[PDB]
Every structure is written in structure tokens, then in C-alpha cells.
Design an enzyme around this catalytic site. Sequence first.
Site, mmCIF file in Angstrom:
data_model
loop_
_atom_site.group_PDB
_atom_site.id
_atom_site.type_symbol
_atom_site.label_atom_id
_atom_site.label_comp_id
_atom_site.label_asym_id
_atom_site.label_seq_id
_atom_site.Cartn_x
_atom_site.Cartn_y
_atom_site.Cartn_z
ATOM 1 N N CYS B 116 0.861 -1.183 0.000
ATOM 2 C CA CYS B 116 0.000 0.000 0.000
ATOM 3 C C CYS B 116 0.904 1.242 0.000
ATOM 4 C CB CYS B 116 -1.025 -0.068 1.137
ATOM 5 S SG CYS B 116 -0.390 -0.576 2.722
ATOM 6 N N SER B 121 -1.040 -1.150 7.055
ATOM 7 C CA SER B 121 -2.452 -1.239 7.426
ATOM 8 C C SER B 121 -3.284 -1.902 6.339
ATOM 9 C CB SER B 121 -3.031 0.140 7.833
ATOM 10 O OG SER B 121 -4.413 0.062 8.182
#
Lengths: 165, 175, 175, 165
Positions: B116, B121
Amino acid sequence: DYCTPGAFELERLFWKGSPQYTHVNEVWPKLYIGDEATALDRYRLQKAGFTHVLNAAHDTGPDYYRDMDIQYHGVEADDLPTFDLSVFFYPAAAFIDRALSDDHSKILVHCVMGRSRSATLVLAYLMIHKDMTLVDAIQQVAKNRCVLPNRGFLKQLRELDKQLV
Amino acid sequence: DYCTPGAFELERLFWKGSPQYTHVNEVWPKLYIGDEATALDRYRLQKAGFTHVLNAAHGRWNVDTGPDYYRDMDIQYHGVEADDLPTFDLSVFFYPAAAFIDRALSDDHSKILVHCVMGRSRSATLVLAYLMIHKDMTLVDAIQQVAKNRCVLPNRGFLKQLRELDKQLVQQRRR
Amino acid sequence: DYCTPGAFELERLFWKGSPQYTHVNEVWPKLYIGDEATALDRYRLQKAGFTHVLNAAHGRWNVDTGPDYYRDMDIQYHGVEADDLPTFDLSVFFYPAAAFIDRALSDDHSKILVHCVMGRSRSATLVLAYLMIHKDMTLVDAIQQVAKNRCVLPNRGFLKQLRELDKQLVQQRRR
Amino acid sequence: DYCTPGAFELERLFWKGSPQYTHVNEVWPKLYIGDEATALDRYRLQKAGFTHVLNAAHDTGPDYYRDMDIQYHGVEADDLPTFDLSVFFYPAAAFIDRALSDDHSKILVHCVMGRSRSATLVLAYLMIHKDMTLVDAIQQVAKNRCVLPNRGFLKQLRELDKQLV
């Protein structure tokens, strides 16, 4: 029995869970490092499917284990910088390699605490038989179990690392 | 080139080395979780043999790569357009993202990057889900498997979404 | 000279920075636990204003410095001749070593180095004892205070010796 | 109530005890960072001698606290990178400095989790009033409590660090 923990406890796991500080941990497939309580709890070992115990702090006895189809060996080592555990790197590693050759096998390497003597033999094993540098080996084991070979054992592992390179 | 470090730095490794805080980490065999820098460095991905990239921050407003970015490189791309926000429903993406990771990992030759922006996360959540769905793990087991290889902290919403998945899979595995 | 590091390395600090694995650390105000290198580097001790050195590995067979080693530097020296061995009775040294740390720390101007070879076991034990005896701490509180500033691990024998001290002090403080 | 733990548990403390993962921790003398459960448990706060609560996630009310001689203030912040918490660095820090000026005072800075919003205000406080760089401040807080300001808050603290230097 298991239930999904709440948020607070999941977050503790992200922060403090790794490396875990416990009686025993798997540090490599089918290869566990643990303390004495884990080695002596033979009903747990048998139900956990254990096949081999390597005691880096050999007294209990093979009769204690031979009554359950567990191959035992004891290296009679002290956790002191003045003990040259390097005398056992090759034959301990050979024992571990032989056990792990068979898929059915699960091996426990232990000492009193499972932090120094046993850790050093598994490190040596990974170096001699799985083509690891001492750094790669430490990363493999330390992420799975809090270990700290004594200053002498570490000097011995450095010397093994030099010979292998 | 590699040499044996001195005693002092080997000790540091025992105390401080695990988990390491780096751009990318292998968190399961052939499965890496990385950050945006890692996704962008094509020379270094190709040199390392990556065959799949799952971008968990897909989109022109997030990490704007897409399949075109990897043209000529022999990468399969899967894009999940997600915000790192507790209000974002990452859970609709759990099964098909995981299916993409599973198809990659069926082939021994494959090596997959899930990234990401930070790889803490969004990507982490997708890989936790993968482990739970395809490797029979509880949420706890999955976290232990990932956290020991990479520093990760999914946001509170993603955690609740993982919890809702966990409850179902546990119920299912009572069988 | 100091500049603000980038986001990535500040993050590393949150994840990996505490406790740090370094040669010396302040573990209580004006109280440092260090290793042999730290004890030996006199230029750097004097530049930092050390006024006291407690060598928990004193002796010609251990860290062979002694008071002569610090001649002309304006350091008070206390030597404990100890082996890092579970068989060694470090406990006879607990009160007078602690008394030396306490007299140093009475004077705001003082800054004390307690060291051994690694500054993880011998010196650490003496400072735990100091905190328990002179700052009203339980063994647990003392460990939390030190471990958060320095990676330390007293040997099993020293731990049992600390436990025997802890039981007495707790009994005493019921009063 | 306290008893001296056995060896196994003492060793866990050396390995995993620091930084501790808990509801609340003291991160600087008389300055605590904690979560919501800690802020809402007002009988504990009063018995612990608390004097000030700063809620970096302001609803509960000052009437909840004013019935016990606790000065309250709420900053209405979200834990999102799109919230500019820097708008509050100086006045939050001033609140904390004023509270800590008196020796009798003990202050709780909290948010929901006590990991991001509250942490960022205490970091800013240490920088503005205790002459710390952002690095020194992070070392002070992080050794006492697992904290992680969100990526936006961190960018904001970097910018504060640049202005102060």
C-alpha cells in the site's frame, strides 16, 4: 475453546506479541526450542506428536522417553562462556537433520531456560545444513523465540560463521 | 561481501532485530508486504523475480501505478482501491484479493508483492485475511505470523472487519 | 548539526527505538550503565562530566582499570571484583555499592558510570539493588525503570539474589 | 498484595516488559498518557490523585469531572491524517505546562486508544517546553508507552521540529 479477542488485546499482539516469550516455540518447521518444563511434560510431548528430544543440558534419562517412542539424546553442556559448545555443532546438527529428514518427525531442542545452549545448537544447525549466515540464522530464530546465546557461545558461532564463509 | 559482524552488533540483533522496520519483508513463503517505494522500484522488483503485485492502494488518488506501470515486466497486477480509514469497507475485497494471492502461490515460481503506501495497514489486512481464509489460521495465528516478520498495525475499522471474518471462519471450522 | 529525520526513520523509532542497544545509557537521572569500552574512553567520560565510576568488573583478571586509570581526572572510583556467574555472590556487595551510588547522587553536580564488561548483568544487578534499597522500589518497578532505558539480563543467580533482597525489603516496608 | 515474582516471569519482564502495553502509563513526571477507560474511571483518577484531564478526543463533560476538583479540557480532534492537530500544539502544551508548574498536580492526557492524538500533544509539549528535539521526545515517550502518531500527525510534528530548530 478459542474465541476472537477484543480490540485492546489484538492491539497488544501487534505491539508486544513478537517475538513471543513462552515455554516453547517452533523456530523452523517441525523444530521447537523450549525449556525444561516442556521437555519433562511427556504427556504433552506425545499428544503434540513429538518424535525427538535433544537436551542441551543433559539428568532425566532415555527410559523416561523410550516408553513413548521418542528418540532422546543429551549433550552435557553448561551455560557458561567457558564451555566450548562448538564441539557439538556438527553432531547435534546431524541429529536435527536426520530427524527432520522424515516428514512425520517433530523435534524439541531444549535446555533449562531454552534461551542460550539450545538456541546455539539450532543456530549452528541452520548454518551448517540450511546454507544460512549467522545473521540470517539469528533472524530466523529470534523472530520466533527470545534467545540470547552467552558471550562465549556467540564467539563460537562467529568462528563457525567464519569457517563456513 | 558478507562478513561476520562483531559480537556487539550480533547482540543488537538478538535484542532489537525482530521484527525489523524495513520497506518490504517476506511474511509467508514467497509472499512479501511492502511500501510504495518498493512497488515503484521496478529494476529491484525484476532483479528479485517478482511475478505478481497486489496494490492495496490502487487508484489515481492513491499509489498511481496500475498494470500499465509494469508493462513488459511479466507481472500480474491486482488493484484494490482502498483508503486507510476506519470507515472504509476493506472486507468486500477480502475473498477476491485473497484468491489472487492464492493463485500466485500455487505456482512455486511465483513471488508476490502486496503493498500500500506504508505496507502497515491496508496491505497487512489483506494478507491477514488471506492467511485466515486459505491457511486455516485464526486471526491471532495470522497476526503472530505477520507481526514477527513485519511491523504492522491495521486501523481500528480494519481490525473489526478482521474480527467479523474471524468469527465466521471459526464457526465454519467447528463443522 | 541535528536535523529532523524523514518520516520513515521517525517511524522506525516508534517501533524499534526503545530500549536502544548501545554501549551506555542513562537509566535514572545522572546514573549511567555502560560497558567496558565506555569505561575505557577517558576523553569521552571527561567531556561528558563523569565524576564517579563504579566498576562492577574490577580486578586485574576482569576490566583492569582501577583508581590509577582515572588519575588526574577527578573521578571517585569504587571497585567490585565480580564474575558474571550464577555461582558468584554479588549480594554481599549490594549495600556498599548502593551506598556509593547514593552518595554520588546526593550531589546535583555528580554523574556516575556503573559498568562491567557488557553492562548487562553485573552492573545492572547493582543498579537494580540500588533502586530497591534507596528509591523504595520493588524488584519489578526497578526492572521496569532500567529495562526501558537499557537492554539488561542479569544471570539466573543474580536474579535469585535480587529476589532474596526483594522479599526482605517488602517485608520491611509492611512495617 | 505485591509478591516477588518467580524467575520465569522476571525474565519475561527483561525481554517483553518495556515498553509496556497498558491502559495508561506515566511518560514524564506527573504526566500520564492513557486511553478512554482510564479517563472515565473517575474513582480511580481521584484516588490516584489526578488533578487535570486533557481529552484529545472530546463527549463526556466537565460536570463529570468538576464534581471532583479535576480541571478538564477537550480538544475535539479526529485520529486521521487530514486533521491538523498542530492548531492545538501551543495551547495544549500551555495547559500541560501550567498543570505541571504546581507540584501537587498530576495530569492525564488521553484519547480513545491513547496511542496517536494524545501522544502527539505530549510530544509537542516536550519539544516546546522541555527543549527537546522530536527524536529526544519520541525516546522519552516511546520507552514508557507504545505510541504511534498517525502519518499526518507525524508530518505535523516534523514541521514543528523544523520551526523549533
